[PDB]
Amino acid sequence: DIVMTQSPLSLPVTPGEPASISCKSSHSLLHSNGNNYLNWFLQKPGRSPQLLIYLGSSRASGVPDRFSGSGSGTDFTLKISRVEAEDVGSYYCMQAIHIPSTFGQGTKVQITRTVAAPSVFIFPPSDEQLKSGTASVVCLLNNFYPREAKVQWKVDNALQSGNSQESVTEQDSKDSTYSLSSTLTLSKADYEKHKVYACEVTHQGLSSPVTKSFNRGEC
Amino acid sequence: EVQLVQSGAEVKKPGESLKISCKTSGYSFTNHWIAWVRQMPGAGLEWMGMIYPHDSDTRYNPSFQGLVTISVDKSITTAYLQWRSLKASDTAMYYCARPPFSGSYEGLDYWGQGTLVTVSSASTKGPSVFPLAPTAALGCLVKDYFPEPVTVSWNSGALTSGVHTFPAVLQSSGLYSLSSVVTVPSSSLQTYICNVNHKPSNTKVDKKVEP
Ligand SMILES: OC[C@H]1O[C@H](O)[C@@H](O)[C@@H](O)[C@@H]1O
């Protein structure tokens, strides 16, 4: 099989600036008929791949003309002339000269923006859930940049570990930020043994860590 | 307009057969190859094989040959992908795809929206939906379901700005959980309703989120 090598696998870039991705095949994609059987695709989060360039250098219908492809033989390049915020996603090359068709591993384009602090919100467990004997405490970090962020749970000022999980959204297509949720899970029995529940957030956009908290039962 | 409309998400037991569908419209069905592509969760793309519907000519990836069969039904312009005996490793998203032009295979252009296949011994479990009560922030916690996926919208799709629906997290219980949040003007606190659908369990919930 033909091996497709993409580089870089991660590509930071600033809107307005040019960007370019390399795709190198182990074998020539140049057909006897003169065409290179190499297509480029963009796969945005939660969507199916979409054609950008086919047969080496033909822009597909509807693709903005800031996208272009070039190359021949084994070395190919996708070039974005002026990156937009909406271009975040993963980019793939695919060869169609040899069965089975094979893809590059994908290049994840990350959109650079200014540092942005999270807005932090804490949510006590609902009365409905507490009926059932479990307590989920949720801390939301909204619309921040860059992605690195530390969430520290504290119960009666005791540092928690091993009882929380985090989920992070993909970069927003308009403002290029991330959001994160952390869920602290305790049994109703453990939740009722304590009063102050707090999540402390550390992030580049914050001069000092920010703590949101509540007292159980008080509102 | 070209459409590749794939069948819905599937949960099957190991050892079972499975056939998923790709309903095409908007173009000459008989003279365009249809290819099938696997995407493992958060991974890349693997080409499985393809079929030319006119004469059901097929070409397979040798690593999938014999494990799957591709076929068509011209009378309803539909292509199929079939496993004789599902394995846990077949849990993945599957796409159908079509080349830019009729005739000889030149690569791919149009892609279907994908079909999620989950191969599991476990029974389906519907979520419990709990409120995250309130710029203010509010949302819904969709807890303890299996298999993926769930969908969440706000106010029947009328509220889209400021919504973040998080990737599901797999909990130590072996069940998924996810949260959906929205930021809204503090002054309104308007009626806010999260619409949760977990089709595998016929679970549908419209929770009103109030302070
Ligand atoms: O990011 C540019 C983007 O423009 C459109 O909105 C999308 O539909 C994609 O097809 C394309 O890649």
How are the SSEs placed, and which strands pair?
The complex is a heterodimer of chains A (219) and B (211).
Chain A: E1 4-7, E2 10-13, E3 19-25, E4 38-43, E5 50-54, E6 58-59, E7 67-72, E8 75-80, E9 89-95, E10 102-103, E11 107-111, E12 119-123, H1 127-131, E13 134-144, E14 150-155, E15 158-159, E16 164-168, E17 178-187, H2 188-192, E18 196-202, E19 210-215
Parallel strand pairs in A: 2-11
Antiparallel strand pairs in A: 1-3, 3-8, 4-5, 4-9, 5-6, 7-8, 9-10, 9-11, 12-13, 13-17, 14-15, 14-18, 16-17, 18-19
Chain B: E1 3-6, E2 10-12, E3 18-25, E4 34-39, E5 45-52, E6 57-60, E7 68-73, E8 78-83, E9 92-98, E10 110-111, E11 115-119, E12 128-132, E13 136-145, E14 151-154, E15 163-165, E16 169-170, E17 176-184, E18 193-198, E19 203-208
Parallel strand pairs in B: 2-11
Antiparallel strand pairs in B: 1-3, 3-8, 4-5, 4-9, 5-6, 7-8, 9-10, 9-11, 12-13, 13-17, 14-18, 15-17, 16-17, 18-19
The complex binds alpha-D-mannopyranose.
PDB class: immune system
Keywords: Fab, Antibody, immune system
Assembly: dimeric
